[PDB]
């Protein structure tokens, strides 16, 4: 078709392998590291998920006795008591494609703060929220980590 | 943070912490999904896997490829979490990392 | 060289005979680079014993401010290569540090419009100073980004545009000309 | 004259000494004569010899000397990513240089999209100022501050 | 022997010939010298093929035996985290392997660049040790615990 | 004509000059046997100049002439796939590939290899279709609509 | 070739005609491996017709072992590949066992430090027991992790370590060393 001259390039096109060939020589086991240890956070991902996932209903249905038919009401007075909405602590990090941010919502609130006095189930039931919020956190930076590792893994190896 | 999923199970949400407000028959939930994002001024709103939680395409078909609060799939009714657990692991990881 | 081949009889035939060899690329002068020569491909060995005259005329530490710079012009390649291996994608903080540095260094620092009013010529105090103009920013760049400053605001620094209008200045205006920006530097950087 | 050399051979026996001999030169690209750009003409390396001295002050318009040189490197930086682009990804790249490539196709597509166009010395200059407008006085380190905005 | 290639091409006779009868190899790189290293002499690229037996016990410094193959595989080992800064960063790397870095720099700047200095065969061996101190006694897998547990 | 080429490139005239002179051109791509395919012959260049006149119908199974090419575009784009596979991940494709894929295995040691097996023109083609069982009559457009339902 | 070449006259020519090729790998050696003969890169057409006599005079089942164990490379060539970096991880279990054996086959069986007097000299019927001892331990080793036995456990049995030395064993005690060692497995494995 039509590519390049003939002489003189010999030496330049030669430095190609060194550049390509070498750049990628190690670049392979390069990303391999973050993915290897990366799992350490993934396994744990379900650590809390499964753990508090089953204890989630624990209180929810637990107070379905004297609070079940009376929840709507118990909820009025202490519903979204201290629902900050992003009071959460967001973190920035670096991964192929740019730098994606993570974060965890850690703040004293679901920590037995909605008052209205109430019966017995409430306080035990409100405590349950903990396994959503608190737990739902394990995944925001770990469950998001996985996708992050997806791009790299793929783009890199591609 | 204002997220929803199921009415019957959401109730607690509105109780402490956040305020969840979804339907268990609103399989579509799209009605809300979008509206919710109209503002999207919370962290990352998620929902049960009984609605649109498998197809994240919902959030992306609406956000338009922008970085908006992401989705997190569950189930509402639990039973065995030793099934689609080792699976979600496989679901992210295979189409990349771990093939076989 | 007819084909321009650097391995032509005439190329080598002059080698080992005459030191401080230089190369002429094709897109170099056609683009905006003047003189249009090879960056690395052009080295010099006489500059070693050429320091005596320079030391006094220029300064007792001039071969120092000139050798530490060539340090980058030729070390910068360290990244140059990876650049042609990926690009600004996986850039970290020292990354565009050098890249661009050397970059401007060739657009206004190296390229000299021999067809301009005065720039056609530059004395020591001329050659010597400039080689410092950037340096400062470099110095201040080292603690700007390292402190945490994002190279991003560092990039569009208005004073940066000042460091590139130094080549066109004459030996007369130059002296005081640069010294006025040498202040605006530490000021329009350390700040941000 | 006009010498043809099999395939894109710039080091062909022909262009060798001819380059030296001839003061300046012009280059043609197949890439454009087969994609559409007609007339398809591009001097990626052609930049004559004494074309730089003979226009700009007096006969032509004030602005011109620093203009040509401007357009030159100005474009170079552009297509430059034409490669790195086809390697890393599609959008992968800082938001600024994004403009560089974003205009490449422009300059080329348009500029060389000349036709039976008589294109006068002036009809030219204009276009040039119309394509340079995509990045205000910032990268334009060839022309002076006055002239630069002069036709901005 | 001591010569230069046409363009530093080992495919030429000037290099091939030698690299065929000569018992070793010792080149100089632009890189090395560019940063100021003097003498700018690479690592593995240079080496006396038959100086590996006439050293150590009886010859020069008994422990030289393993000392000679220590700094070789140990040093170059660091030359990896040397071009990988732009990847993660300085503290973005582990302690154990990151440490294998500071070595390289203190190694080329001071260890290789020795200018006109004249280090006696013994004043020269010590240095190695000194640099090796970077890694706590127990990280060097090249020499024996016996020799390192002493000179180190 | 049965003779090995230089290293393994047809670029050489050894095989090149052979191309025109000799009718057609068949090879083994040294990929089949090196792996376990016997006969280790590859379909890349295989294709004779006198195979056309004297085959297909009458001479042999009338659907041979039709399934001639069918297989051709089917297997080819088969490996094509396996190429980009390790390039993005075994998963990044659709039904448009998951089918041409298995088409590369079936044809692989499945059809080509067989050892000293004495497969006749009957046994051969008879099952030659058992490979196109997955591929629908729509995805193919090389043969008619009659022979496709003949021995599906 | 003094320049470690693969394609070159000298070479691709010899290959033209020979009978056996014993490629040595610079790396495999660079590790201090002796012999560090790289096999994926070695060959000998003789075996073909020599195989016949193999079992004829040596042992009817002799070849069937060699050609049999060779699977290492077969299930190793494309096994190491991806698994070289990743390693013992997402692997089911039998995954490792495949490269685990290679390890002994390559650090015990393969390596024959022709330097030492012990494993230096050796005759077929000697090496044979060696390869075997690793086989009869394999046909059950994989049947173990597939039936329920641990992976990173089987691998801590001193009975197998006695194999690494089988090569080092004297050609005369090898037999006697075989009697016990071999049968030692049948019972050294019965524990899970």
Curated annotation (Swiss-Prot), chain A:
Family that this chain belongs to: Belongs to the V-ATPase D subunit family.
Full-sequence portion shown in this chain: 2 to 159 of 223
Domain of life according to the entry: Bacteria
Listed GO biological process terms: proton motive force-driven plasma membrane ATP synthesis
Keyword Ion transport: yes
Protein name: V-type ATP synthase subunit D
Keywords assigned: ATP synthesis, Hydrogen ion transport, Ion transport, Transport
Single GO MF annotation: proton-transporting ATP synthase activity, rotational mechanism
Known role: Produces ATP from ADP in the presence of a proton gradient across the membrane.
Curated annotation (Swiss-Prot), chain B:
Transport is among the record's keywords: yes
Top-rank taxon, per record: Bacteria
MF terms in GO: ATP binding; proton-transporting ATP synthase activity, rotational mechanism; proton-transporting ATPase activity, rotational mechanism
Keywords attached to this entry: ATP synthesis, Hydrogen ion transport, Ion transport, Transport
UniProt cross-references to Pfam families, sorted A to Z: ATP-synt_F (PF01990)
GO annotation terms (biological process): proton motive force-driven plasma membrane ATP synthesis
Family stated for the protein in its record: Belongs to the V-ATPase F subunit family.
Function summary: Produces ATP from ADP in the presence of a proton gradient across the membrane.
Name of this protein: V-type ATP synthase subunit F
Organism: Thermus thermophilus (strain ATCC 27634 / DSM 579 / HB8)
Record gene name: atpF
From Swiss-Prot, chains C, G:
Disulfide bonding pattern of the chain: none
Cleaved signal peptide residues: none
Family note: Belongs to the ATPase alpha/beta chains family.
Free-text function comment from the UniProt entry: Produces ATP from ADP in the presence of a proton gradient across the membrane. The V-type alpha chain is a catalytic subunit.
Protein name: V-type ATP synthase alpha chain
Gene (name only): atpA
UniProtKB/Swiss-Prot annotation, chains D, E, F:
Similarity-based family: Belongs to the ATPase alpha/beta chains family.
Listed name of the protein: V-type ATP synthase beta chain
Residues of the full protein shown: 312 to 463 of 478
Function: Produces ATP from ADP in the presence of a proton gradient across the membrane. The V-type beta chain is a regulatory subunit.
Gene name per UniProt: atpB
Superkingdom: Bacteria
């Amino acid at each position: 078709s039509q590519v390049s001259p003939t002489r003189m390039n010999l030496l330049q096109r030669r430095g190609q392998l060194r550049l390509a060939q070498k750049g990628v020589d190690l670049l392979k086991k390069k990303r391999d590291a973050l993915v290897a240890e990366f799992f350490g956070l993934v396994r744990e991902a379900m650590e809390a998920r499964k753990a508090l996932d089953q204890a989630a209903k624990e209180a929810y249905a637990a107070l379905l006795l004297a609070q079940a038919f009376d929840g709507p009401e118990v909820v009025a007075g202490a519903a979204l008591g201290v629902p900050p909405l992003e009071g959460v602590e967001a973190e920035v990090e670096n991964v192929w494609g740019s730098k994606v941010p993570r974060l965890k919502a850690t703040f004293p609130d679901g920590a037995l703060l909605s008052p209205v006095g109430t019966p017995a189930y409430t306080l035990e039931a409100s405590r349950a929220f903990r396994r959503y919020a608190e737990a739902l956190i394990r995944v925001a930076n770990t469950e998001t980590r996985l996708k992050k590792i997806g791009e790299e893994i793929k783009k890199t190896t591609r | 943070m204002a997220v929803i999923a199921d009415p019957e199970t959401a109730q607690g949400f509105r109780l402490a912490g956040l305020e969840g407000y979804g339907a268990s028959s609103a399989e579509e939930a799209q009605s809300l999904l979008e509206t919710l994002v109209e503002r999207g001024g919370y962290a990352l709103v998620a929902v049960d896997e009984a609605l649109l939680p498998d197809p994240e395409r919902a959030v992306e078909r609406l956000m338009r490829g922008r970085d908006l609060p992401v989705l997190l799939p569950i189930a509402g009714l639990k039973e065995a979490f030793q099934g689609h657990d080792v699976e979600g692991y496989m679901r992210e990881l295979v189409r990349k990392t771990i093939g076989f | 060289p007819p084909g321009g081949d650097m391995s032509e009889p005439v190329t080598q035939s002059t080698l080992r005979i005459v030191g401080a060899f230089w190369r002429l690329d094709a897109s170099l002068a056609f683009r905006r680079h003047f003189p249009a020569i090879n960056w690395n491909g052009s080295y010099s060995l006489f500059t070693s014993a050429l320091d005596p005259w320079y030391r006094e005329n220029v300064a007792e530490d001039y071969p120092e401010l000139r050798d530490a710079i060539s340090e980058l012009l030729q070390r910068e390649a360290g990244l140059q290569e990876i650049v042609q291996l990926v690009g600004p994608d996986a850039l970290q903080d020292a990354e565009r540090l050098v890249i661009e540095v050397g970059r401007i260094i060739r657009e206004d620092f190296l390229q000299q419009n021999a067809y301009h009013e005065v720039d056609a010529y530059c004395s020591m105090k001329k050659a010597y100073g400039i080689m410092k103009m950037i340096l400062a920013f470099y110095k201040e760049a080292e603690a700007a980004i390292k402190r945490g400053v994002s190279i991003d605001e560092i990039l569009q620094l208005p004073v940066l545009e000042r460091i590139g209008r130094a080549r066109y200045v004459s030996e007369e205006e130059f002296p005081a000309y640069f010294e006025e920006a040498m202040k605006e530097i530490q000021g329009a950087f350390k700040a941000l | 004259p006009i010498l043809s050399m099999p395939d894109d051979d710039r080091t062909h026996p022909i262009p060798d000494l001819t380059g030296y001999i001839t003061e300046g030169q012009i280059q043609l690209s197949r890439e454009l004569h087969r994609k559409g750009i007609y007339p398809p003409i591009d001097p990626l390396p052609s930049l004559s010899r004494l074309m730089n001295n003979g226009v700009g002050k007096g006969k032509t318009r004030e602005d011109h000397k620093q203009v040509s040189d401007q357009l030159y490197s100005a474009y170079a930086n552009g297509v430059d990513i034409r490669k790195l682009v086809a390697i890393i990804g599609e959008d992968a790249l800082t938001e600024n240089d994004r403009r560089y490539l974003q205009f490449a196709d422009a300059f080329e597509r348009f500029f060389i999209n000349q036709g039976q166009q008589n294109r006068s010395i002036e009809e030219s200059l204009q276009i040039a100022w119309a394509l340079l407008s995509m990045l205000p006085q910032g990268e334009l380190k060839r022309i002076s501050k006055d002239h630069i905005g002069k036709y901005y």
